[PDB]
């Protein structure tokens, strides 16, 4: 072995995922997963990967991390009985940012099922990469919802990988800080969480540079705080060196990569200035280390760019070059007025000076030096 | 996450 060759990819998708509706005006649109799937099908990428339909993760599988009281609430709460659970809705942070909608628990089952099934497929060594764009809900806590996330599929999928992998690496390129995954593994060295995010008057308000873990997990939590308007060049200058240094020091046997698309330029909620190529550059950098890799979705609220980003990142995982001309698809009008696969960055100012990026990286290398 | 007015959200 030398670390190369085309990798086998297992892809998880349920045709019913695009019908769940968060409500009028809510930016989280599960329809973006159906757009992504339909776009890569018209590109012909189904011929290069195995497409699986995930099972519905049971309440028992979810209670491997979440509390019984919180999961039982998710099975019970519905739009027709919210009045009876008005106290429990506030206790579990459900009702506003994470609303109640029809099929809420089923949506959590499908999103979680794809992640845990991918981790099982990786544990059994039946694939090199597993893709679940419905996953990556990195904000969900043990006993409460947060940031549109109800069940933390990442934590459950990593707990599955820990059955056969001594050390697991979690990388989070969502524009928001992966607080839920970091909190779950904050006091253990068996999981290292690396999050790149915007910090400063931004959800969820965590992810400071000085948050490095606690207890046996000290120096096993990495956070790169960023400012508005970071572009592909500045992002690529720090991602590859930091990920390379993490691989050298931590040496994981399995990697989980949350590919939140809300760090792209023009996102409805994000304020970064990344393109699809700059975003997908993170995928092929993690891919070069030739470790079992679980690719998950997450943020992304300009859904036409979300479909672009995750389609191209699927082709990157397949090492398949696809043309910039978008083929016809069931949502062709969503991609106007250009109908191109790749996007161009805006003219917004990059408040991340090159010296700032170099200073934060230098202080992170100091923390990585404290590993055995 | 969605909106402003404190707490980010
Ligand atoms: Na992140
Ligand atoms: Na940790
Ligand atoms: Zn996000």
Establish if B2 touches chain A: CB-CB under 8 angstroms: yes
A147, A178, A202, A203, best to mutate vs chain B, most B CBs in 10 Å: A203
Q: Residue A304 corresponds to which tokens in the numbers above?
A: 């036409």
Taking an 8 Å cut-off on Cβ atoms, the answer to whether B8 and A26 are in contact is no
CA distance B5 to chain A (A): 11
- C-alpha of residue A78 to centroid of ligand 1, in Å: 31
Of A27, A148, A205, the CB nearest to B8: A205
Establish if A203 touches chain B: CB-CB under 8 angstroms: yes
Question: Which residues of chain A neighbour B2 with C-beta distances below 8 Å?
Answer: 26-27, 97, 148, 269
- C-alpha of residue A261 to centroid of ligand 1, in Å: 10
Q: How many domains does chain A have?
A: 1
Taking an 8 Å cut-off on Cβ atoms, the answer to whether B2 and A269 are in contact is yes
Taking an 8 Å cut-off on Cβ atoms, the answer to whether B1 and A97 are in contact is yes
Taking an 8 Å cut-off on Cβ atoms, the answer to whether B1 and A205 are in contact is no
Residue A261 domain boundaries: 1-372
Identify whether A204 is preceded by a cis peptide bond (ω within 30 of 0).
yes
Tell me whether residue A174 is annotated as binding.
Answer: yes
Establish if A202 touches chain B: CB-CB under 8 angstroms: yes
Largest CA distance in chain A: 60
Taking an 8 Å cut-off on Cβ atoms, the answer to whether B2 and A202 are in contact is no
- C-alpha of residue A84 to centroid of ligand 3, in Å: 31
* Sheet-wide strand order for A191-198: A50-52, A9-12, A129-132, A293-296, A254-258, A168-172, A191-198, A221-226
One-letter-per-residue 3-state SS of chain A: CCCCCCCCEEEECCCCHHHCCCCCCCCCCCHHHHHHHHHHHHCCHHHCCEEECCCCCCHHHHCCCCCHHHHHHHHHCCCCCCCCCHHHHHHCCCCCCCCCCCCHHHHHHHHHHHHHHHHHHHHCCCCCEEEECCCCCCCCCCCCCECCECCCHHHHHHHHHCCCCCCEEEEECCCCCCHHHHHHCCCCCCEEEEEEEECCCCCCCCCCCCCCCCHHHCCCEEEEEECCCCCHHHHHHHHHHHHHHHHHHHCCCEEEEECCHHHECCCCCCCCCECHHHHHHHHHHHHCCCCCEEEECCCCCCHHHHHHHHHHHHHHHCCCCCCCECCCCCCHHHHCCCCECCCCCCCCCCCCCHHHHHHHHHHHHHHHCCCC
Resolution of the experimental model, in Å, one decimal: 2.3
CA distance A97 to chain B (A): 7
Q: Which of A31, A139, A177, A197 is the catalytic position?
A: A139
Tell me if A41 sits within 8 A of A160, measured CB to CB: no
User: Is A66 marked active-site?
Assistant: no
């Amino acid at each position: 072995s030398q670390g190369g060759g085309k990798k086998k990819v297992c892809y998880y998708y349920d045709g019913d995922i695009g019908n769940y509706y968060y409500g009028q005006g809510h930016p989280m649109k599960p329809h973006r997963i159906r757009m992504t799937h339909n776009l890569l099908l018209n590109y012909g990428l189904y011929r290069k990967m195995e497409i699986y339909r995930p099972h519905k993760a049971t309440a028992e599988e979810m209670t491997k991390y979440h509390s019984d009281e919180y999961i039982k609430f998710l099975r019970s709460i519905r739009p027709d009985n919210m009045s009876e659970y008005s106290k429990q809705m506030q206790r579990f942070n459900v009702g506003e940012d994470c609303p109640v909608f029809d099929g809420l628990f089923e949506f959590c089952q499908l999103s979680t099922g794809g992640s845990v099934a991918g981790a099982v497929k990786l544990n059994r060594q039946q694939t090199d990469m597993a893709v679940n764009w419905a996953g990556g809900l990195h904000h969900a806590k043990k006993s409460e919802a947060s940031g549109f996330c109800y069940v933390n599929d990442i934590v459950l999928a990593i707990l599955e990988l820990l059955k056969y992998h001594q050390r697991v690496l979690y990388i989070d390129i969502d524009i928001h800080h992966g607080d839920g995954v970091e909190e779950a593994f904050y006091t253990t060295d068996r999981v290292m969480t690396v999050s790149f995010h915007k910090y400063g008057e931004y959800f969820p308000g965590t992810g400071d540079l000085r948050d490095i873990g606690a207890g046996k997990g000290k120096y096993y939590a990495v956070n790169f705080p960023m400012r508005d308007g970071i572009d592909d060049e500045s992002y690529g200058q720090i991602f590859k060196p930091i990920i390379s240094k993490v691989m050298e020091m931590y040496q994981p046997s399995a990697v989980v990569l949350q590919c939140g698309a809300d760090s792209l330029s023009g996102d409805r909620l994000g304020c970064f200035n990344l393109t699809v190529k700059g975003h997908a550059k993170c995928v092929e950098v993690v891919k070069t280390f030739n470790l079992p890799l679980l690719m998950l979705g997450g943020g992304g609220y300009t859904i036409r760019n979300v479909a672009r980003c995750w389609t191209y990142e699927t082709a990157v995982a397949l090492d398949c070059e696809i043309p910039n001309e978008l083929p016809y698809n069931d949502y062709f009008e969503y991609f106007g007025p250009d109908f191109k696969l790749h996007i161009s960055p805006s003219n917004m100012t990059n408040q991340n000076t090159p010296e700032y990026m170099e200073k934060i990286k230098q202080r992170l290398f100091e923390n990585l030096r404290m590993l055995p | 996450x969605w909106x402003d007015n404190x707490x980010x959200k």
